[PDB]
From a paper:
[name] from [name] K−12 (EcDsbA) was the first and is probably the best-characterised DSB enzyme to date. This 21 kDa periplasmic protein is a dithiol oxidase that catalyses disulphide bond formation between consecutive cysteines of unfolded polypeptides as they are translocated to the periplasm. EcDsbA consists of a canonical TRX domain, a hallmark of proteins involved in redox homeostasis, with an inserted helical domain. The TRX domain harbours the conserved active site CXXC (C30-P31-H32-C33 in EcDsbA) that is featured in many proteins of the TRX superfamily. The acidity of this groove originates from a cluster of negatively charged residues (E24, E37, E38, D44, E85, D86 and E94) that map along a buried channel in the interface between the TRX and helical domains of EcDsbA.
Numbering used by the authors: 1 to 188
Write the structure that this text describes.
C-alpha cells in the first residue's frame, strides 16, 4: 500500500478508548513544537484536510520547562476554557522561545491581557474548577497514550503520527504528507 505501519504512522499497542478523534500534544518550550506551529503551521493544515465533523484537540504537556511549564499547562486550559487559543498561541511561543520574555506566571497573564482577555476574566478562569478539570484532563490523556515527548499526534486513540518517516527536504511537502496522513487515519 501507500500508507503503512512503521512509515507515516505507528499503531499503539494499547489503544485508548474514548480518546478525541485527533489529539495533538505540544509544549510552548519545545523547539520542534515551535517549528510545527510557527514555521510549518501543522495544526492549520491538518484542520483544512480533516473530513466533515472531525475536530482536532490540542493539549499542553508538563514535562518541559519546570514550574513555568506547569503554569503554561494551566494557562492553556484557560485558553481552551475561554476559546482564545488562536489569540495566545503565537505570543506564548514567541514569549518563551524567541524573546524569552515569559519567565513567570505574570508574564503569561500579560500575554492574555494584551490579546484582549481582561485581567479579572483571566484570574477567574485561572482559579476556576473548569480549568482544574482541564489541567487534569490534559495530564490524563498524556498518560493514557504513554506520552514520552512532543510534538505528538494521535488519531482515534489508535494511531500515532510518525513524522520522522516523512520526507523533510521540502517543508511544504512534509506538511501535506503529515496532513494527508491525519486524514487517512481519521477514516481508517
Amino acid at each position: 500500500a501507500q500508507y503503512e505501519d512503521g512509515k507515516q504512522y505507528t499503531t499503539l499497542e494499547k489503544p485508548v478508548a474514548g480518546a478525541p478523534q485527533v489529539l495533538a500534544f505540544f509544549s510552548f518550550f519545545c523547539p520542534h513544537c515551535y517549528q510545527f506551529e510557527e514555521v510549518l503551521h501543522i495544526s492549520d493544515n491538518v484542520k483544512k484536510k480533516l473530513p466533515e465533523g472531525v475536530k482536532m484537540t490540542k493539549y499542553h504537556v508538563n514535562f518541559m520547562g519546570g514550574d513555568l511549564g506547569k503554569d503554561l499547562t494551566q494557562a492553556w486550559a484557560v485558553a481552551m476554557a475561554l476559546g482564545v487559543e488562536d489569540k495566545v498561541t503565537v505570543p506564548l511561543f514567541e514569549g518563551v522561545q524567541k524573546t524569552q520574555t515569559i519567565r513567570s506566571a505574570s508574564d503569561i497573564r500579560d500575554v492574555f491581557i494584551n490579546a484582549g482577555i481582561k485581567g479579572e476574566e483571566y484570574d477567574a478562569a485561572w482559579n476556576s474548577f473548569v480549568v482544574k478539570s482541564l489541567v487534569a484532563q490534559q495530564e490524563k490523556a498524556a498518560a493514557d497514550v504513554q506520552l514520552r515527548g512532543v510534538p505528538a499526534m494521535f488519531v482515534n486513540g489508535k494511531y500515532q503520527l510518525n513524522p520522522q518517516g516523512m520526507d523533510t527536504s521540502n517543508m511544504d511537502v512534509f506538511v501535506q504528507q503529515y496532513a494527508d496522513t491525519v486524514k487517512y487515519l481519521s477514516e481508517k
